[PDB]
């Protein structure tokens, strides 16, 4: 279980994906040319998880960059770490999906898909022991959403024994005015329920609310929102990226986090919350990290964890701190708040401590929870979808591409069952 194959699809997928690659390269001491210039053997011990080693010195991200629109490609190459990527790994169409899931999943996306599988087969076959796949995309657009889910399905067919992991960004009226987003999201969720092993639910509603309420940014940009994503992405992958005991690989993580196959949507949480390239001075204490990381204000999904119950939790502490203090604080949090942890999954909170803090902070905390409160995110998409579907608004955009109303009805039903299943486990008693 060494190598992970990373895929970036659409605008959001490529922006969040670029940010991930620049953040982790700095953490592993890799410069934009691909050369290691760090000063810790810990940075290279598990470098093979995300990077290939090529011509001597140099390290190259095992990343595939995809879009139906040529624009984002240029935008990535031009970005800070843009030159680090394999040039042959850039697979771009000419059209763009036009916020239409059907175009991404059945039309233009389907025409570009085999070119993508070409590049992913190449990266996968080079692996000594492939863990699986990590996909970054949005659920509200057409490419990341539709083509993204088509990819998952095609890759799963070829690699059924591997772990399929996603960073799926959920739409919000607060950030995008695209009226069809609930449709694209509902059609995508349906695919994710059936075809992924683990999904990090990154809600633009939560991202916007943090920037506006907490960070006091009147008008937040994608740069502000992406700064929280990159923090989260760095935090959740720390255990895969550095030597440790807990959730060290995608399968072990899935086994600890996923009690029921369909319930694989994680509510990520992070502390401290910061704005872009801003100092600093004063780092959180262990009780502060323990309390802050569990707050509704620190969730990357717009759900209140106190509105549900945790099935399972993975907590990652980064920085130089007392493991004794960490263990004591973590036990206190689950004895004081026992009503938010299901009684029928004993010792369901797992803690890890990484000595290496991320850039900017001396101390940080990442939370990965499988909470029944995530049903709030799905109810919000569902109500928006229904408001539109009830009136058959914009259906011809999708029916024009050969889709039937039945697929809409099916996707909706599947998402309502998922909500209904979370509610079932929220109400389940140990007795």
């Amino acid at each position: 279980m060494r190598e992970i194959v990373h895929i970036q699809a659409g605008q959001c997928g490529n922006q969040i994906g670029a940010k991930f690659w620049e953040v982790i390269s700095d953490e592993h001491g890799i410069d934009p040319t691909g050369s290691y210039h760090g000063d810790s053997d810990l940075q290279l011990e598990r470098i093979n998880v995300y990077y290939n080693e090529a011509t001597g010195n140099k390290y190259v991200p095992r990343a595939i960059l995809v879009d139906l629109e040529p624009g984002t490609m240029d935008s990535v190459r031009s970005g800070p770490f843009g030159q680090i990527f394999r040039p042959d790994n850039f697979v771009f169409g000419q059209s763009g999906a036009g916020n239409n899931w059907a175009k991404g999943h059945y039309t233009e996306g389907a025409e570009l898909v085999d070119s993508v599988l070409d590049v992913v087969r190449k990266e996968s076959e080079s692996c000594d022991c492939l863990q699986g796949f990590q996909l970054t995309h949005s659920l509200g657009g057409g490419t990341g959403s539709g083509m993204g889910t088509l990819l998952i399905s095609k890759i799963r067919e070829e690699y059924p024994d591997r772990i399929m992991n996603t960073f799926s960004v959920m739409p919000s009226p607060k950030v995008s005015d695209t009226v069809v987003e609930p449709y694209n999201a509902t059609l995508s969720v349906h695919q994710l329920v059936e075809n992924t092993d683990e999904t990090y639910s990154i809600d633009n509603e939560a991202l916007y609310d943090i920037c506006f309420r907490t960070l006091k940014l009147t008008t937040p940009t994608y740069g502000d929102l992406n700064h929280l994503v990159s923090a989260t992405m760095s935090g959740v992958t720390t255990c895969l990226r550095f030597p440790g005991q807990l959730n060290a690989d995608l399968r072990k993580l899935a086994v600890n986090m996923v009690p029921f196959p369909r319930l694989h949507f994680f509510m990520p949480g992070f502390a401290p919350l910061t704005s872009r390239g801003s100092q600093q001075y004063r780092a959180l204490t262990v009780p502060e990290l323990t309390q802050q990381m569990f707050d509704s204000k620190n969730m990357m999904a717009a759900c209140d964890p106190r509105h549900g119950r945790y099935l399972t939790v993975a907590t990652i502490f980064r920085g130089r701190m007392s493991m004794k203090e960490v263990d004591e604080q973590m036990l206190n949090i689950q004895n004081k708040n026992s009503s938010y942890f299901v009684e029928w999954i004993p010792n369901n909170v797992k803690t890890a401590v990484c000595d290496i803090p991320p850039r900017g902070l001396k101390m940080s905390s990442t939370f990965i929870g499988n909470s029944t409160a995530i049903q709030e995110l799905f109810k919000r998409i569902s109500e928006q979808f229904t408001a539109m579907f009830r009136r058959k608004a914009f259906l011809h955009w999708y029916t024009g591409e050969g889709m039937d109303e039945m697929e809409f009805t099916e996707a909706e039903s599947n998402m309502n069952d998922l909500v209904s299943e979370y509610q079932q486990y929220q109400d389940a008693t140990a007795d």
């Binding site: 279980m1 000594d128 022991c129 005991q245 807990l246 690989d249 399968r251 072990k252 086994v255 600890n256 996923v258 009690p259 029921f260 196959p261 099935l311 399972t312 007392s322 493991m323 004794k324 263990d327 009684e343 029928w344 999954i345 004993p346 010792n347 369901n348 797992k350 486990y425 389940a428 140990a430």
Partner: protein, 431 residues
């Protein structure tokens, strides 16, 4: 000539083996290159034409990480490469992967290597199997090996050193599942199993050795010391000896009732110096005190069915019989009525050896007690309860089913545990 083959399965099994073999080398004066400037050590070390002493052991893991540390470490020249076996992908904390999916790939190889070690034995006593209950390898691969050893070697003695799971140090939520499945599957194949509760060891390290946050290295050094006491009677010629067969006969009244409680004394920190020298009576008395136990349970609310006392160092039979005479007069130490009381005593000349730079103090005399008490059923009950809590909801079961296991195997395993619990209850009653 009275050989014992040691098998070390998964991370726990391998890391304890490292601690054990390091200690045996110190005890027998064997350098890390296998060179040495009694005779009994030959039951555990074979000799080559070059005068080198090689452990009669096999190290198996489904991932290479842990065993790779052996092949690069201080004792790389101690073992021949062929006796260090590794796969590429671990059993991901899943019993089904260890036993079937992944295990099946390396099983014939492991058996071939054990066959080669058995070929060098003129009078093989049997096997010592070191593993955890919690891991996918420790649970699943061990069950597979055990079953296979019963085919190849029939009734030949098989003894276990099993790591009983503790939440403090636990890495997987599914550890109670893996524990019950392995116990059910191994039950009829094991002659005598010595369980080691990780919470009991953790608390001895904390409370006795003043270690704030004990690590596997700390736990392992202590575990190894108990293992060395159990095996010294086989590796040395002392005042009173006990073989693999003698253990089975004195500790096991019924085939299923094969789980002795281990208690060790004294455990003194490297500091103070005044904290000794403890007498034979003081150390014997310490064996009936719960704080010194290897498994968390209350013997006061249980009955002893067999006792074995393994003394080491400056110890005399008169001092020992005197100490047992007082134990025999204690109303608070209850024995079953169908027992003549039964005390199996072993005495070896060598004082307990400590690893230079370790946490333990050098003692003139020490003792390990192996007692078969009905109180050990409290540990099965604790495991069975955690199993029941998750199983009632079928939580995580899809992971095992996905690997070709059936829900029927879970029910059978639990019913067998229910029977074992009933067996300890029945054995405790008077006729």
């Amino acid at each position: 000539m009275r050989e014992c083959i040691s098998i070390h399965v998964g991370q726990a099994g391998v890391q304890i083996g490292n601690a054990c073999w390091e200690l045996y080398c110190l005890e027998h004066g064997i350098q890390p290159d296998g060179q040495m400037p009694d005779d009994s050590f030959n039951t555990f070390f074979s000799e080559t034409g070059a005068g080198k002493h090689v452990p009669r052991a096999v190290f198996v893991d489904l991932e290479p990480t842990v065993i790779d540390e052996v092949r690069t470490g201080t004792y790389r020249q101690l073992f021949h490469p062929e006796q260090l076996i590794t796969g590429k992908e671990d059993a991901a904390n899943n019993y089904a992967r260890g036993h079937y999916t992944i295990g099946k790939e390396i099983i014939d190889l492991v058996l071939d290597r054990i066959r080669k070690l058995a070929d060098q034995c003129t009078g093989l006593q049997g096997f010592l199997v070191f593993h955890s209950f919690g891991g996918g390898t420790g649970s699943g691969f061990t069950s597979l090996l055990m079953e296979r050893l019963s085919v190849d070697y029939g009734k030949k003695s098989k003894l276990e050193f099993s790591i009983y799971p503790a939440p403090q140090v636990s890495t997987a939520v599914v550890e109670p599942y893996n524990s019950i499945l392995t116990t059910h599957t191994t039950l009829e194949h094991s002659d005598c199993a010595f369980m080691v509760d990780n919470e009991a060891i953790y608390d001895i390290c904390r409370r006795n050795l003043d270690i704030e946050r004990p690590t596997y290295t700390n736990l392992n050094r202590l575990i190894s010391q108990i293992v060395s006491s159990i095996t010294a009677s086989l590796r040395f010629d002392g005042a009173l000896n006990v073989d693999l067969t003698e253990f089975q006969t004195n500790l096991v009244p019924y085939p299923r009732i094969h789980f002795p409680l281990a208690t060790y004394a004294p455990v003194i920190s490297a500091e103070k110096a005044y904290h000794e020298q403890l007498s034979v009576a003081e150390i014997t008395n310490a064996c009936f005190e719960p704080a010194n136990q290897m498994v968390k349970c209350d013997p006061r609310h249980g009955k002893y069915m067999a006792c074995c006392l393994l003394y080491r160092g400056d110890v005399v039979p008169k001092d020992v019989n005197a100490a047992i005479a007082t134990i025999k007069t204690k109303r608070s130490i209850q024995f079953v009525d169908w027992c003549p009381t039964g005390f199996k005593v072993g005495i070896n000349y060598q004082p307990p050896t400590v690893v230079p730079g370790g946490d333990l103090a050098k003692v003139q005399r020490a003792v390990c007690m192996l007692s078969n008490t009905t109180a050990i059923a409290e540990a099965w009950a604790r495991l069975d309860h955690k199993f029941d809590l998750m199983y009632a909801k079928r939580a995580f079961v899809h992971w095992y089913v996905g690997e070709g296991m059936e829900e029927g195997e879970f029910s059978e395993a639990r019913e067998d545990m229910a029977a074992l619990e009933k067996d300890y209850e029945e054995v405790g009653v008077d006729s």
